[PDB]
Design a protein around this ligand. Structure first.
Ligand code: PV8
Ligand code: PV8
Lengths: 363, 363
């Protein structure tokens, strides 16, 4: 009783995703009239976001697209789109529509649970089947950043709806903490990483936290954010900083601590994690964010979480000494706007690459 | 008695520039047979490098190319190319050829002395005459990085020839110090920046230097490098770090010092300059390397000096606290290879941009 998926994909891919600000997410209420609004918004917005990214999947190299794991993920997206299409003609006034819709979103979230490692298997299949080539590799890199960020955004919309309209922290709005204590999240991530480091190495570096609240030097630093995302980024950074520290100090009983600075400025809330884990040459930094060399998507995915609300995650090392990692976040909820890839000529053109000698000299 | 310039430009632009390593520059001797070799090399290589970049000038937007200052710089390049063409049929065995050639190179260097600010006037003329647009601006950015790096490389070849074949440090090979003490250059740059800071603010931050020689903890850190280039980068960084420090501490008599770490690893020699000058939001970092917003090319040009021998110069700030700047250099002379732009399809295509909506969403 539904049209073929391609008809829906073509229709919805014409629209641009509509980025929401942290402030907008937060300003969304929990009434039945709010739920109807969420419903009528999401039955348009989720298909738009699904369609847009599905169109880009089709731009992947034939070699990548032909892999069974990429084809599997595609099929999940198709079914999720179709699931939502069942609601196009349903009455928001009917409470059964709303409850069924929430169930359908839960089913979609579960279906897509293993998307990240499934796509990674697809990349591995491409490499095993054909051997990798630099043109395909660049396309894969460009695509995966956009695909994973798109996924993050879709999961955000679904979690917001299901959490609000169906409780550890009643003060949270869905997955959003309007008063996230940044240092508390830092400590939580450190604690968990320490458990892992202690398990394997029977030791771990201590943590030192310093806050710089530029405008209000006394006040503990808080922000509007999704703590699970911040936790995710910090846990990944701690794991790397701890491993570097212990491994570069095999002969020592005294380990240099990991130092974190949390700075609050007018526009940025920045979190720097500094280790003395011996560092890595500049040449090897890019590779840390590479899906190909990582085929462990911890770092590239953490950076996408940072970028999702207009932030970033940057690494700077000093080979022979150690490494600084910085999470840049927007200080203000009004500046924290979803960063969403969109399917258009620009995106399309970016895939249109091919083999040739670069614009810089080789000896 | 010479052909029209375009015939020479077309001929020489077919070749790729030939990048030399620091080790190769250094291994070049000072005999008459070495001079003849330098001559026969440079009468081919300099025209290749001149032609390659001249071809890219022609790819600039009509709006930029039409400016009197860009046209002036172009005319200098044309005359310099032609000057060298006078030597195509000359006998290297004749000492008069060699001496005349050295004179011609000196004349070229002098002719091009004001290239950097003359091009900047061209950018200003474009902005004043037409108003700037983002497409042209991106082209200008791409082109100027390549144009200025090309210029750096040409100046390197000329200085090497004129210094060697025509003396404060007899141990230097042309402009190259085979035993450059990095901390000494740091101190020289600091001293000069301090003079300027003291003049305007009647105070300046102190300097603290720490060295980390990973493989030989006792040994002072030395490298093969061109000290004037290292000095140039450090002076620019000190000026910025000092200004930030003093201006963000208007009420204080106590200024936090500027801290420099010089680290020597297996592959990198890295120099970090840390200030507590209050920092800048991430949003504003890109602009620091922008020729358009700088229309003060100090930072972008310093970064090009770093990139010229396969290094880099990177800035990381923490708004509300301060800024780290890192110069990354190759530790080994064999890894220090000229980075030279080349005129080919790839370079050509990169100019082929135009107006459209980007691949990311706007609200
Ligand atoms: O790349 S690192 O500098 C680095 C990368 C990311 C990060 O967040 C922190 C780091 O220190 N570091 C990793 C590591 C892991 C094991 C080991 O023996 C040495 C090192 C160095
Ligand atoms: O951008 S900065 O962080 C910066 C940029 C480059 C650099 O090398 C060091 C820096 O601190 N800094 C400049 C400056 C100059 C004057 C002022 O009042 C404040 C600031 C901040």
């Amino acid at each position: 009783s539904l049209a073929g998926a391609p008809k829906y994909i073509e229709h919805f891919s014409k629209f641009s995703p509509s980025p929401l600000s942290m402030k907008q997410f937060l300003d969304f209420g929990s009434s039945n009239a709010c739920e109807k609004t969420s419903f009528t918004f999401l039955r348009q917005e989720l298909p738009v976001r699904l369609a847009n990214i599905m169109k880009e999947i089709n731009l992947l190299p034939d070699r990548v697209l032909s892999t069974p794991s990429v084809q599997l993920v595609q099929s999940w997206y198709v079914q999720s789109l179709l699931d939502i299409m069942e609601f196009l003609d349903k009455d928001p006034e009917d409470h059964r529509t709303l409850s069924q819709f929430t169930d359908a979103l839960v089913t979609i979230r579960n279906r897509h649970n293993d998307v990240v490692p499934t796509m990674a298997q697809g990349v591995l299949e491409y490499k095993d089947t054909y051997g990798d080539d630099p043109v395909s590799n660049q396309n894969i890199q460009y695509f995966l950043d956009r695909f994973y960020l798109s996924r993050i955004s879709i999961r955000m919309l679904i979690n917001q709806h299901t959490l609000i309209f169906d409780p550890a922290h009643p003060k949270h709005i869905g997955s959003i903490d309007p008063n996230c204590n940044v240092s508390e999240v830092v400590k939580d991530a450190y604690d968990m990483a320490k458990l892992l480091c202690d398990k394997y190495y029977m030791a771990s570096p201590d943590l030192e936290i310093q806050e710089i609240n530029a405008a209000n030097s006394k006040q503990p630093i808080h922000m509007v954010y999704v703590p699970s995302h911040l936790y995710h980024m910090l846990f990944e950074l701690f794991k790397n900083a701890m491993r570097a520290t212990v491994e570069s100090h095999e002969s020592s009983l005294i380990l240099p601590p990991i130092k974190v600075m949390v700075a609050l400025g007018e526009e940025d809330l920045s979190i720097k994690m500094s280790d003395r884990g011996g560092g890595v040459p500049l040449r090897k930094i890019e590779r840390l964010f590479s899906y190909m060399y990582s085929t462990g998507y911890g770092l590239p995915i953490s950076r996408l979480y940072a970028k999702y609300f207009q932030g970033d995650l940057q690494l700077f090392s000093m080979e022979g000494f150690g490494t600084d990692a910085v999470i840049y976040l927007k200080a203000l909820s009004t500046d924290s706007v979803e960063r969403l890839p969109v399917y258009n000529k620009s995106a399309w053109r970016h895939y249109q690459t091919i083999q040739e000698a670069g614009d810089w000299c080789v000896p």
